[PDB]
Design an enzyme around this catalytic site. Sequence first.
Site, PDB file in Angstrom:
ATOM      1  N   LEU A  21      40.759  35.787 117.957  1.00 36.86           N
ATOM      2  CA  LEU A  21      40.059  37.047 117.609  1.00 36.86           C
ATOM      3  C   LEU A  21      40.387  38.283 118.866  1.00 36.86           C
ATOM      4  O   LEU A  21      39.860  39.374 118.770  1.00 36.86           O
ATOM      5  CB  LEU A  21      38.310  36.830 118.189  1.00 36.86           C
ATOM      6  N   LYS A  24      44.651  35.534 110.231  1.00 40.62           N
ATOM      7  CA  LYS A  24      45.822  34.591 110.421  1.00 40.62           C
ATOM      8  C   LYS A  24      45.570  33.500 109.476  1.00 40.62           C
ATOM      9  O   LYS A  24      44.636  33.071 108.873  1.00 40.62           O
ATOM     10  CB  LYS A  24      45.743  34.020 111.896  1.00 40.62           C
ATOM     11  N   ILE A  58      74.524  65.307 100.750  1.00 39.99           N
ATOM     12  CA  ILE A  58      73.534  65.364 101.699  1.00 39.99           C
ATOM     13  C   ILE A  58      74.014  64.325 102.744  1.00 39.99           C
ATOM     14  O   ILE A  58      74.345  63.398 102.761  1.00 39.99           O
ATOM     15  CB  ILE A  58      72.261  65.272 101.260  1.00 39.99           C
ATOM     16  N   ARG A 101      84.663  50.831  94.106  1.00 35.02           N
ATOM     17  CA  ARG A 101      86.010  50.842  94.779  1.00 35.02           C
ATOM     18  C   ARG A 101      87.106  50.883  93.821  1.00 35.02           C
ATOM     19  O   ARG A 101      86.800  50.256  92.698  1.00 35.02           O
ATOM     20  CB  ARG A 101      86.235  49.647  95.704  1.00 35.02           C
ATOM     21  N   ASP A 205      90.208  63.845  99.407  1.00 32.33           N
ATOM     22  CA  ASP A 205      90.199  64.790 100.269  1.00 32.33           C
ATOM     23  C   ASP A 205      91.827  65.037 100.605  1.00 32.33           C
ATOM     24  O   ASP A 205      92.274  64.216 101.069  1.00 32.33           O
ATOM     25  CB  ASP A 205      89.715  64.525 101.606  1.00 32.33           C
TER      26      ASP A 205
END
Length: 284
Positions: A21, A24, A58, A101, A205
Amino acid sequence: NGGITDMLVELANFGAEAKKLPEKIDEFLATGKLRKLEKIRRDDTSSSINFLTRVTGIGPSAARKLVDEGIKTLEDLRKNEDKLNHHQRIGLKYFEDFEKRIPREEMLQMQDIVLNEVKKLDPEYIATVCGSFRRGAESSGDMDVLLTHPNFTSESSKQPKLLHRVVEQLQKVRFITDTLSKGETKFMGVCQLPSENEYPHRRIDIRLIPKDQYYCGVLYFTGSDIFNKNMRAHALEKGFTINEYTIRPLGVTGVAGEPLPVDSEQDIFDYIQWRYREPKDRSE
Ligand SMILES: Nc1ncnc2c1ncn2[C@H]1C[C@H](O)[C@@H](COP(=O)(O)OP(=O)(O)OP(=O)(O)O)O1
């Protein structure tokens, strides 16, 4: 009991019936979970954030407010077109394919066409897909071709058109299907091999570098990190610092330097004496 000591570890994560107290069960040992905490449910909103980043373009700023735009899901964004740029617009539209991938079968393929394109263009170019495929690996996630030309160096620092020439080209051919950015010394985008009876698009890239800063910048993208992390070291060990850009003799108090010239890869390896640690073996 060992038994009562465990439900214990479960609550904190989350006199005897008094410190209690101070509810549980075996209910803790059982598990509520995410649902049990439902704080945790607000914590999974952090699953919004990182999932949201998963979308192209983002970065830190982006998603946070976006999600904050009451938003959080695949479809939130899917509606929320208006809320982002040409970039992120794509890395949504593709993104899914984005999490798959490639096969070095196709690589070599574009591997070709890329360097095959340039070659069609001029001889003074030199390009090289790098990153992983180079290392030998069966699986990348982004193409990454490194370009350079004698008519260009770290001194001129002014020749967009150059790099520009091929981007135009790779597009010509309908290969480079779309385009994220563009900003003279860097291009990042979306390709796709050719059909006749369709393969998913892959992140590429194109970079460029003075035909001088070339090499160092070269070793660097073939990584890995740790690899390029274990090396910065030793050179430094032997007193030498290096960076994405170049080889520099050190200094008396740390700050000191000067770029040694740089013909090929192995020339640096010469600098800090190490064996020409071939790509494949370039893990650590
Ligand atoms: N969007 C990203 N944000 C941050 N780090 C990234 C991102 N994408 C990839 N990375 C880093 C961490 C990954 O473990 C690593 C691999 O990226 P990827 O583009 O897939 O290269 P790579 O596939 O040839 O190697 P690998 O994936 O093994 O790490 O690159």
